[PDB]
Write a protein that binds this ligand. Structure first.
Ligand SMILES: CCCCCCCCCCCCCCCCCC(=O)OC[C@H](COP(=O)(O)OCCN)OC(=O)CCCCCCCCCCCCCCCCC
Ligand SMILES: CCCCCCCCCCCC(=O)OC[C@H](COP(=O)(O)OCC[N+](C)(C)C)OC(=O)CCCCCCCCCCC
Ligand SMILES: CCCCCCCCCCCC(=O)OC[C@H](COP(=O)(O)OCC[N+](C)(C)C)OC(=O)CCCCCCCCCCC
Lengths: 88, 246, 164, 125, 86, 108, 83, 243, 47, 53
């Protein structure tokens, strides 16, 4: 019935779409796995929070502070979402 | 007795419907703040749950009507003078059932999406073992009340032969004494309050999202089961454990 | 060789106990289908008894062995299906039937379906006992045992502390 | 916070540690514990009344402090029953007398013997 | 199957365990259905003599005689009905 | 105290406050549009005060937001079902595949 | 008159009428309940008998309403005589 | 096992054999004091059980409340009360040694510790033991179709007949038994299996033999208590002082 | 004047597009209403 | 073919679920209309059982 499985490529697609549809990004084709949120994507000290909340909403998760602050790279977010069995 | 028999059918239908809804979400979530717009995705579940909710709201023709309106009328028809207040208490609980079923229906089916997108990609109706029960119980929750009316609520039925005292029998007075206002206010109230809750939630949703501290505190007491599980646990159970340690 | 009352009482007991005796030997597939089928048959029997009672309304009784006869206190295992009882049984059997067929699809991919279906029929059996008794002692038997069954069914997912 | 039953056992602890009890229900669920269900690490000291502050203890409720909760509970009950009582004075009069029954109130059919009418007899006629 | 995980095979319950579905369950189900049908038939047939209707078992002449004997006893012992002491 | 206005501790604190406010807005508000409105308004209120320099007024403002978060708490917060406060959390835990440890020389 | 002949106690017992229904109008309840037993209490069956008994009871209700009419008038008479 | 099953019942037999047949008038004057002591013994011992950390100690405290109910029954001057006290003695002598086996010969032989904080989630590796625990718990708290209920019911009947107020207040036994027994059962059978305990074997054929004998007996005398009347229909009237 | 634009609007747009508009969020409600109206008209014509 | 921010497509509900939905709703509304047609005076309070005053 619930025939659905997550994969790293799928997480990457959903996260890069999430970042593409965020207006406060610098602009597109800065968004890759190696991208940094502060330096490359040009995000403030609260747009990272908005991104982490959006990732929570997207993959059906709850990211505490000690695991939220240490997300500073897109690959880090992908690693994190793939390290949660309930990532939807 | 009659309302017990009808409640069994349409409430079991409601819970079965809720189970199908819970299994339609990838993460099997039970919060109506995270369902959204599952009408076109779950139409059979929708018609079954709204059948059950209308046979719980006491709408005409269904089992809820025959099983529930007569009690609100017997509140007035009772020979005791003091039972008139119970009419209004029961009436308010009726116009509240309209609310807490229409809330379910809106937040689950009619509203805008609140989940992620993959949920709606994978939303699906469940298998035959779930749907066939819901079908049968919907047939029951449509017809069984009208079938069993003259058995249970009829004039002089004698089937369930409980020896009521003659001084206390108020059915003949209940069906006749009841005037138009006290007979129509429950039904009209239901059919109006339902429309109003849907319309407010769709067009004027700020009415339910004011963010007032004095409204929110009342919501919080009513959201914490009328602080009933905090009084029991603290002032009875915990003090009992403390006296037991003493 | 036909007793509505005795079939009604004994078939749910079979549906409860035979899974507990033979679950490792039968499996959840057969246990699901068998428990379902037995409750369906009990439901049909109750519908026929309800028809016949509307026709006649002379309740059948079932007077079995003696529990306690000491000093002015005569308690027997006596059962009866009157109007109130057959109504409660319509509700009980119909909802148990539909719930049994519903939980085949709901509880698939659960490792412990056998115990679940055994306990659903446990509750059905003891509620039939509650409603059919002709004395308050049999009622209390059913009362306490449905409490037990409620505890076990709410505690079905034993690994969840909040469920316990 | 130490409660009454906790700081009453101060003269009896002796060499046992006086530990500040904090219920496990309110401890942070997202940290990693050796017993994640009980929310306890292995060598963690236990208060003398740990039975009361463990996860199998009764539930705490954080939103409302308990005295305010009692105010709201007993206030709701008093509002309900007081309004119920007040509304009895604002009741309409009935429009028909109670029913009445033929044979002197059915005292015979209710179990009377011509001196028991006041006990078993129903309404007049 | 779907959604499954490892479990200890040496845990033995009277119920199944974890996803019990042995590869002989049709034969065992035949046995269980036989025993169940037999037990049900036995219980029904053996409990037929212990069944009765509520009404029509005792003539109302017997009821009349018993109530009359009760009255005889009551006035032998000099007793009045409930409420008559007023 | 010494709540530095442009340090990492202040960053953690204010990011946590922003997360808490947005989650409270999600939990209280049923409609999506009003929730986004409130989130944008909260971001506006944080951006107005992102320029503060004086540590005293800063500490006052932080205390003020603490009071606002305590005032608009939610009693029944949204948590995903598989996560600790959830409906599915410790439902069917896979058992630890341990071997039997013996205790008697004679009893299996 | 509108009311049928009152049943005697012996026929009330013969038909085993519940005491709440042992009123002036019980003579029309007998055929209704035998028809119900005959037709398995279904609602499409005994319309005429049910309507007859219901109208007989409506007549009793109107009578009791007129009794309370008289009672209210008497109490107001006593009131304005008491002043 | 011997203590809880037989030596505690020697006192009940001693009442019936030494104190009621002799000393009838002193007993019929003193029994309200007996009722004071018995009600205290019931409620305070049950509540004291609710804050114990040792399993065998919990079962030990559990014996005392049921013996207090038996004392209510035997000091009731009612035939039903005497029969109930005797059935309580017998059924407790069946059930309490089974619980003592579970908490002192199954678990203690595997782990050599009895502190409740170590035990959790026996249901996963030890399921048969969990079934036995649930059965014997619900038998000890007085579920019908066990002799425990029959005895409790008739002892409280007699206590109510003798003193309705005390005998009625004593019926919170039905609740407090459930509390202190199920608070233990729920933790032992419930949750994730303990990290302080390694896996061990489930119950053996010997332990199961013992528990099954003791369960069959109590179920027999709960389903038909009347089978014990052919040796007690004199005893239920030999010690009754009513003129 | 009290107006501000959402930097997540392009992400939130699908919640009001096809099968989620104010039309499509109410089309399936009252599914078999017309069939019932027609059949009841036929029934009353068959009186 | 997953548009992760885009307009999601119409759901592919089966035929049996579309046919059973229109059968229950049709039955419900038909039953409601019929019961209202044959019981509107009772449910609306149009029969006045009180006497003529
Ligand atoms: C203080 C001395 C008392 C002496 C007289 C006896 C009084 C009654 C018994 C109270 C004694 C204290 C009981 C302490 C047992 C606590 C054991 C325990 O740990 O279990 C906890 C359990 C609740 O677990 P919980 O935290 O709620 O988890 C919920 C998430 N699912 O908690 C429970 O299961 C609670 C079970 C007990 C229920 C008691 C209910 C009493 C409520 C009375 C309401 C009034 C109703 C009207 C009565 C009229 C009487 C004339
Ligand atoms: C728990 C149960 C408590 C119920 C309390 C609500 C009672 C109620 O709302 O009704 C109130 C009843 C009314 O009694 P009455 O005989 O009809 O007098 C009615 C005439 N008055 C109002 C002048 C007295 O007051 C009681 O009798 C108990 C208080
Ligand atoms: C009336 C006299 C007694 C009637 C006969 C009862 C014994 C029959 C054998 C039952 C076997 C069993 O229930 O197994 C015990 C189950 C095993 O669970 P599982 O489904 O096999 O999956 C295995 C998954 N574990 C291993 C992770 C759990 O452990 C339990 O969950 C504890 C609940 C006990 C259920 C009690 C059954 C109902 C009886 C209650 C009567 C008071």
């Amino acid at each position: 019935s619930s025939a659905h499985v997550l994969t790293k490529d799928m997480i990457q697609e959903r996260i890069v779409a999430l970042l593409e549809s965020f207006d406060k990004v610098n602009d597109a084709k800065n968004i890759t796995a190696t991208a940094n949120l502060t330096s490359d994507l040009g995000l403030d000290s609260l747009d990272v929070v908005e991104v982490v909340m959006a990732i929570e909403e997207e993959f059906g998760l709850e990211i505490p502070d000690h695991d939220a602050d240490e997300i500073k790279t897109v690959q880090q977010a992908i690693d994190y979402v793939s390290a949660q069995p309930a990532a939807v | 007795l009659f309302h017990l028999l009808g409640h069994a059918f349409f409430k079991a239908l409601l819970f079965m419907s809720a189970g199908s809804i819970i299994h339609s979400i990838l993460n099997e979530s039970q919060d109506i703040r995270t369902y959204g717009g599952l009408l076109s995705y779950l139409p059979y579940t929708y018609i079954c749950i709204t059948i059950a909710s209308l046979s719980l709201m006491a709408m005409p023709g269904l089992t809820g009507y025959y099983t529930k309106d007569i009690i609100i009328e017997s509140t007035y028809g009772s020979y005791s003078i003091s039972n008139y207040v119970v009419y209004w208490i029961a009436y308010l609980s009726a116009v509240l059932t309209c609310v807490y079923s229409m809330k379910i229906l809106y937040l689950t089916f009619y509203s805008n999406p609140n989940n992620n997108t993959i949920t709606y990609y994978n939303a699906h109706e469940s298998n035959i073992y779930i749907t066939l029960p819901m079908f049968i119980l919907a047939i029951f929750a449509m017809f069984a009340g009208w079938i069993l009316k003259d058995i249970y609520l009829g004039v002089g039925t004698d089937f369930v032969g409980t020896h009521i005292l003659p001084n206390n029998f108020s059915y003949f007075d209940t069906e006749f004494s009841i005037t138009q206002f006290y007979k129509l206010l429950p039904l009209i109230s239901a059919i109006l309050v339902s429309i109003l809750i849907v319309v407010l939630n769709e067009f004027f949703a700020i009415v339910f999202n004011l963010n007032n501290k004095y409204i929110n505190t009342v919501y919080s007491i009513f959201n914490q089961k009328l602080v009933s599980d905090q009084i029991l646990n603290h002032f009875i159970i915990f003090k009992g454990l403390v006296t037991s340690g003493n | 060789m036909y007793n509505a009352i005795s079939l009604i009482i004994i078939l749910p007991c079979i549906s409860w106990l035979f899974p507990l005796f033979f679950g490792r030997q039968l499996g959840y597939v057969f246990v699901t289908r068998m428990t379902s089928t037995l409750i369906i048959i009990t439901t049909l029997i109750t519908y026929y008894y309800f028809y016949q009672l509307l026709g006649n309304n002379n309740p059948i009784n079932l007077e079995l062995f003696n529990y306690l006869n000491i000093d002015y206190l005569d308690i027997n295992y006596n059962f009866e299906i009157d109007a109130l009882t057959i109504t409660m049984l319509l509700a009980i059997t119909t909802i148990s039937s539909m719930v049994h067929i519903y939980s085949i699809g709901y509880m698939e991919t659960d490792p412990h379906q056998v115990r679940f279906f055994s306990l659903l029929s446990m509750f059905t059996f003891w509620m039939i006992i509650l409603v059919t008794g002709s004395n308050y002692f049999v009622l209390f038997v059913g009362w306490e045992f449905i409490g037990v069954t409620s505890y076990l069914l709410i505690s079905f997912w034993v690994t969840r502390l909040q469920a316990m | 916070i130490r409660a009454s039953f906790d700081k009453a056992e101060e003269p009896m602890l002796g060499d046992y540690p006086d530990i500040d009890p904090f219920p496990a229900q309110l401890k942070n669920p997202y940290k990693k514990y050796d017993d994640q269900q009980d929310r306890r690490n292995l060598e963690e000291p236990l208060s003398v009344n740990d039975d009361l502050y463990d996860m199998w203890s009764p539930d705490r409720f954080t939103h409302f402090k308990n005295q305010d909760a009692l105010k709201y509970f007993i206030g709701f009950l008093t509002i309900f029953f007081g309004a119920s009582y007040v509304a009895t004075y604002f009741v309409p009069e009935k429009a028909a007398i109670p029913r009445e029954f033929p044979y002197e109130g059915l005292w015979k059919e209710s179990g009377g013997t011509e001196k028991s009418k006041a006990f078993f007899g129903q309404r007049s006629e | 199957g779907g959604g499954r995980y490892p479990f200890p095979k040496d845990v033995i319950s009277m119920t199944g365990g974890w996803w019990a579905n042995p590869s002989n369950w049709k034969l065992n189900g035949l046995f269980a259905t036989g025993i169940a049908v037999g037990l049900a038939l036995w219980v029904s047939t053996a409990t037929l003599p212990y069944t009765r209707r509520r009404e029509g078992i005792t003539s109302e002449s017997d009821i009349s005689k018993w109530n009359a004997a009760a009255g005889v006893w009551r006035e032998r012992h000099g007793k009045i009905s409930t409420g008559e002491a007023a | 105290s010494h709540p530095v206005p442009f340090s990492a501790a202040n960053k953690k604190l204010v990011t946590s406050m922003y997360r808490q406010s947005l989650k409270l807005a999600r939990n209280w508000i049923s409609n999506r549009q009003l929730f986004r409105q409130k989130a944008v308004e909260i971001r506006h209120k944080f951006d107005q005060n992102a320029q503060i320099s004086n540590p005293r007024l800063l500490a006052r403002t932080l205390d003020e937001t603490r009071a606002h978060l305590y005032e608009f708490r939610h009693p029944d917060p949204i948590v995903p079902p598989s996560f600790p406060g959830g409906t599915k959390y410790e439902r069917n835990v896979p058992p630890r595949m341990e071997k039997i440890m013996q205790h008697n020389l004679y009893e299996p | 008159a509108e009311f049928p002949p009152l049943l005697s106690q012996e026929d009330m017992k013969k038909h085993k009428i519940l005491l709440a229904y042992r009123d002036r109008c019980a003579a029309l309840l007998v055929p209704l309940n035998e028809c119900r037993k005959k037709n398995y209490y279904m609602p499409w069956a005994c319309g005429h008998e049910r309507h007859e008994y219901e109208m007989c009871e409506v007549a009793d209700f109107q009578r009791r309403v007129k009794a309370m009419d008289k009672l209210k008038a008497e109490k107001i008479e006593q009131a304005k005589a008491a002043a | 096992m011997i203590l809880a099953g037989l030596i505690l019942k020697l006192a009940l037999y001693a009442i019936l054999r030494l104190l009621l047949p002799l000393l009838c008038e002193a007993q019929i004057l003193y029994t309200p004091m007996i009722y004071i002591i018995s009600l205290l013994t019931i409620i305070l011992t049950s509540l004291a059980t609710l804050r114990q950390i040792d399993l065998k100690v919990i079962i030990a405290y559990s014996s005392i409340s049921h013996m207090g109910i038996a004392i209510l029954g035997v000091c009731s001057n009612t035939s039903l009360g005497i029969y109930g006290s005797i059935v309580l003695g017998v059924a407790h002598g069946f059930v309490s040694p089974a619980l003592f086996l579970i908490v002192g010969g199954i678990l203690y032989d595997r782990y050599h510790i009895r502190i409740v904080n170590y035990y959790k989630g026996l249901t996963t590796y030890m399921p048969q033991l969990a079934t036995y625990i649930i059965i014997l718990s619900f038998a000890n708290i007085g579920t019908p179709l066990t002799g425990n209920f029959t005895g409790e019911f008739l002892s409280l009947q007699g206590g109510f007949i003798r003193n309705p107020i005390i005998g009625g207040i004593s019926c919170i036994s039905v609740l407090l038994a459930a509390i202190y027994q199920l608070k233990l059962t729920n933790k032992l059978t419930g949750g994730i299996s303990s990290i302080y305990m390694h896996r061990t074997n489930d119950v053996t054929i010997r332990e199961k033999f013992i528990m099954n004998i003791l369960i069959i007996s109590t179920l027999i005398i709960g389903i038909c208590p009347q089978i014990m009347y052919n040796l007690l229909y004199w005893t239920v009237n030999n010690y009754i002082y009513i003129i | 004047a009290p107006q501000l634009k959402d930097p997540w609007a392009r992400r939130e747009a699908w919640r009001y597009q096809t099968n989620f508009t104010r039309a499509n969020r109410f089309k399936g409600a009252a599914p078999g209403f017309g069939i019932a109206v027609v059949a009841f008209g036929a029934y009353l014509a068959a009186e | 073919n997953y548009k992760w921010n885009g307009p999601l497509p119409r759901p592919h509900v089966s035929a049996g679920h579309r046919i059973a939905t229109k059968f229950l709703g049709a039955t419900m509304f038909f039953w409601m209309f019929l019961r209202i047609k044959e019981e509107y005076p009772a449910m609306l309070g149009l029969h006045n059982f009180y006497p003529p005053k």
